[PDB]
Symmetry: D3
Subunit: 261 residues, 6 copies
């Protein structure tokens, strides 16, 4: 039967588990489309990880240029404003190294050039685990978000190939095989992390981005963010959870039953 | 509050004040965004008549020139494009539309790019519509890239229309930001609002048929049944013979919302 | 027309049965020539190898289009992509001989760099119009969680290319030089999570795993320890659907269902 | 050594460089450019019954200042203008790339279109604009010139646009390239006789040459063809730059012929 | 031919080389980076402002890349450089600046960038546009060559209602500029004498502090004086700024364009 | 400053001699490490084979950057591009050994498909920052009538990437991973029509013709009765300028002259 084969493939051939995927790890990259996405999607989990003495590094794809409705606030000023804010925010969470790709907000390319930037940082830092948005989240209308999710996944895979971006090799950045990928802002989580006793810090980590979260905007966003973490919290029977989708690496390619975990 | 279901209910009713009962009721000006000449007529022809008849000003933006839409080996794309503009003029006349913006990107060649966003943003800023209609880019098995990109780009351009740093030369020359009230996505597998068009079906078909280059009698043998089947698909969801479906969601739902599928 | 049907279900059924003349009985029964489009060397074999053999045996002329050269598929730092592309061409010439395939078009886009553009559509179109195949097989570009841009793109470009092959204004220089418009009879999509037609391959399973292993550069002994169970498992996912040990699954739809059809998922 | 290479190792005829040509392709950016740049010479070659085929890169869509006239209608107009203009010159085949006026890409895709028409028609000569004309401000012109030269070279390479080879169209070696609209011609054609007819074939492009526009352009065109005439002591000329293939590449003394 | 040429220029085109900027009321100066207008034609900008010509800038890029300071992020440089251009503009009597905001080193060469320039030209209706000569020999900065070409292209395409047609549908109508003047040119045919404005120009350039430190100025002051002397000497003055102006015609299919 | 010069000629002389300290007697004199950038395999050897050997001999470390893979350089219908590129990699490894070159960076863009983009500048700038060379050699992109885009682009991109290698906001991830900005001392352009410095290669000519000839795929004998005559003529075009038999010509300029300098052609 298929069922026995599926069970055996997962337990005996792949050895993939969902009890804690995040355990073997002392270095991880958290990849974000915009300054503030790491905090919003997985702030809780970044602290929880900070404390185990996990080196948590960010890559931020874009500069946040466009994130204002203020006509006398230029894009260049805002980028500088949001750089501060993410440093303020990252300290609150225990992150101590941010890479800035500096692609303009709303103009993140979907290209080999961007994959190379991520490949270079991966091959350099050799993290055990990479986090990134789930690019298959229903109704996600931000291309910066979609593109981030796809390039993170492809870059993880390609970092392992020496014919991919072969100049890194020629200068002694060697192929690197990441251990796991964990996708946040996801509709299909299979691993939830409890953040009931870290919720308050996260909400604090998030309001540091003052440019994005004013008094008035925060009217809507506090409940929206309270609802979301409940949406996840309720899957494992706590108040506040953060959801991740973790799969076997094989399941990201030609796997007709990927949705069965 | 206690549970997710309560939170979710509180977020819709109170925080955003989200209602599906009557989302187009307040509109005064709408833009209907179409990949090719005929998509407004096919996708939402009855609703556009209803809107016009209520005195809503309905404006089209047509993304492409329909250059490819022929199997006639002696109808060149240019001649077809001219034929199809005259067909949309007549089609839009029947539905009471008086203004059409032609972007003129070649059929099958619609880019997915900042440049096309700026086109839509320009027109949105200038017209200041309360509502914008466009295809649903997540329609399953949709295989026309002009269709998917129209969906995506119309949704992106609505959001970007509000940001003064986005296409900043608009602002410098007098086109201020604009905040649209609603987006409604047609050609959708997931509607949450249905318009009864039973009384306007025959008019819809005549406005579609105005696209003569596209609908020969022979093709109409498959297409009338196809069109009736689709509107019955929609109609049946609110218990009427013929309907037109729309997906309308709060703005927040188009972004980082993992329970977006719960309306 | 279609005015005397009373319900959506009645209308859907009549549209399928009478207007579109669609069934999933034996979709491939009348195939004289088919093209199997694959992203990378080895894709047709893994995705639909059993079925290609079964078609070959019935005297169906089966032709590959291979989208990429496979340049990137090695962790061996001392193996260059050029050499690998040369190796993989020989592995496919040998896979294809096993399965009965006599012709391959190599588009040669570099592995991981397959563009999504009109220029690629034009290649696929030139060939489709040359060969005039009855059927075209390609990966399903909606496979959930499919993370390879080359796969997603081959799928979308296959479907689009099939459609645009019939348009004289698409790539009009093909027409000016004696390559007329062509109307393919069916598309079938492999590597699909929504198959609606399963081919029994229980018998030919061993010949299939051997057309696959022939891609030695991709399948060393230590990798086959994972890939053999994955492959058998995928094949019992499909066969189970029709209660056989081993199947290959395909999604087939009427051409109309690939455009503006909100009930396309009801087949 | 310059001479023991030109008229010895390569055999470079500047006396009558066309003459052996049975079939030639004229590549224009826009409808009308063939007639403007080399209409006199086109007629010459037709009268000698050499087969002259046009490839028009673009649709001429943007060529009007009339706010009432769509670019689609203009393209249809200019297509029939060109069919007429060509009828007057002995041209009985025009290939239409249908890239939009102002939007001609500079890419592999476009080289492929040209390479496909080259490999199918197996021309002896290709005519095209000189992409190095000083102060040429039209990107469609510059890019036509460069893509023409590059496609001619690439048509000879089987690994270039290889599907062409898979479906029957073989590699092809053009004999000569002739660049018109050139500041540096090394071959001039007396067209003093054909001049009233050149101006006729050009004027058939009614959309482009209103009586009022023609007030400026008749003098402009006459001045241009004199500029060429003067160089071989005739009244009306059309200039071409022809060089041996090799000079199109790493040749520091290219400007010496 | 010599007869034809003369007649064309003098009767048909009625082409002035005596004083081509005489009729100007509004001109746009198109610069690749903040400081190019001041560097390439800053004395002419002041001469024009003083005579009541409205001089408007279009700046193509943000100057994001113009620092060797590892701790100065490109965004901060851009903010700093807008402040600097506004200080520099004040001194030259320029009141309006359009910022395209394409990143320094990344200016596209595309229809999209043409549409920005066309929109501005349609809106502003200038009698003149100034831009770098895209054919300056040995020019190595892609942002400079492309401003050149794109300004020249945009000026011509601003007149075609099918080019960027949404402009016209929204009532930015087509517009025909009277002249183009190319600065940073090896081939000038009009020199303005700026001898008595030289000092003010050097001041307007130094307002771009981020770009002209003291050490840097040791090289650039002599460079700039050498360049104004190259031009000045052509009309027997100490310091000139050169421009190439041709008839619109000569920008296209004109094999004898190099005889002016 | 520069207020007491009286004419442009006086100003230009002083600017060259005193402010820029531009010397054309011995431009390469202080070289410890140079990079030679070539569009295709064989371009360094053809362009400057003699000079690279004169440099090697002196203990100058010469590093090659090859922009493309030479995929397209064949008329042989049964020789694929992949195999050609594998062949040319070894033709260049030999050719280089002959000239004393001990490192080659292969960017591996496909021949005829070298992009003119920020991405390629990033590759150059990566290698320049890593190697920290005193000098860079590249084809002169302004060669009149040069009709190969790969060649034009390589020269423009070389000149740009040398300027941009200095700027820490250009390709800022390099800086973040320990690759700092670098300032090359000189640029020398080969394949040039306007050289201002000629190297005598008369006693190295034979060795050059041989290192060129290691590119067997490119130079048959049919080809060579036409390409030895061509090369001997080119090296005499340069040699005759300094009255030796065979020379290699270069264009050298102060970095200032690569930007907004209307008197660039005066040197
Ligand atoms: Cl009937
Ligand atoms: Cl009927
Ligand atoms: Cl009937
Ligand atoms: Cl001092
Ligand atoms: Cl001093
Ligand atoms: Cl001083």
């Amino acid at each position: 039967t298929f069922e026995e084969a599926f069970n055996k493939l997962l337990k005996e051939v792949l050895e993939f588990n969902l009890e804690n995927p995040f355990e073997d790890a002392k270095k991880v990259i958290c990849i974000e489309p915009h300054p503030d996405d790491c905090a919003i999607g997985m702030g809780g989990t970044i602290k929880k990880l900070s404390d185990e003495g996990v080196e948590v590094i960010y890559i931020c794809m874009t500069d946040g240029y466009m994130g204002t409705t203020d006509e006398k606030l230029s894009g260049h000023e805002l980028a500088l404003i949001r750089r501060r804010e993410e440093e303020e925010s990252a300290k609150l969470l225990g992150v101590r190294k941010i890479y800035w790709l500096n692609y303009r907000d709303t103009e993140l390319p979907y290209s080999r050039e961007v994959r190379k930037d991520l490949v270079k940082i991966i091959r350099k830092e050799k993290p055990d685990g990479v986090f990134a948005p789930d690019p298959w989240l229903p109704y996600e209308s931000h291309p910066d978000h979609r593109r981030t999710g796809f390039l993170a996944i492809e870059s993880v895979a390609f970092s392992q190939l020496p014919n991919f971006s072969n100049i890194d090799i020629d200068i002694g950045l060697k192929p690197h095989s990441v251990s796991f990928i964990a996708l946040y802002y996801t509709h299909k989580p299979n691993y939830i992390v409890d953040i009931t006793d870290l919720m308050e810090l996260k909400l604090k980590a998030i309001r540091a981005h003052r440019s994005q979260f004013t008094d008035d905007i925060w009217e809507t966003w506090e409940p929206f963010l309270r609802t979301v973490t409940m949406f996840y919290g309720e899957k494992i029977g706590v108040r506040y959870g953060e959801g991740f989708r973790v799969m076997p690496g094989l399941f990201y390619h030609i796997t007709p039953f990927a949705d069965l975990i």
